[PDB]
């Protein structure tokens with residue numbers, strides 16, 4: 001687990017739909033600049049994953065672990081066809097980077 005390492009993980013995994021370092025602009029993926037502590041459905045000009053929002057799920061560490069293990073199996077609405085996770089180790093390093101920016 002590291003900080004300068006996870007930075008390349010998210011920046012090389014979900015840095016296309018979730019740009020947490022662009023400019024508060026969220027075109028395809030929801031601006032993950034503060035997903036930690038914020039529930040789904042928040043941006044005004046963005047129909048965030050309406051499903052997740054209704055499920056009443058709070059985006060957190062372990063909570064995001066499940067939704068990420070399967071976004072289509074967990075929330076039947078997301079439009080992100082993310083690939084299934086195959087290395088929980090790298091996932092832990094992911095939350096680490098987002099924890100320094102959106103949780104530190």
Ligand code: HEC
Nearest residue numbers: 013014017028029030039040041048049077078079080082
């Ligand atoms: C486009 C190719 C995406 C990639 C790659 C990833 N995500 Fe995504 N995500 C995407 C969209 C379009 C949306 C909005 C839902 C919809 O209806 O389209 C999302 C949403 C999420 C959320 C929910 C946040 C919220 O709505 O409040 C999470 C927690 C999320 N995405 C996580 C996530 C992670 C961890 C990714 C890399 C492992 C990832 N996404 C990639 C589009 C795309």
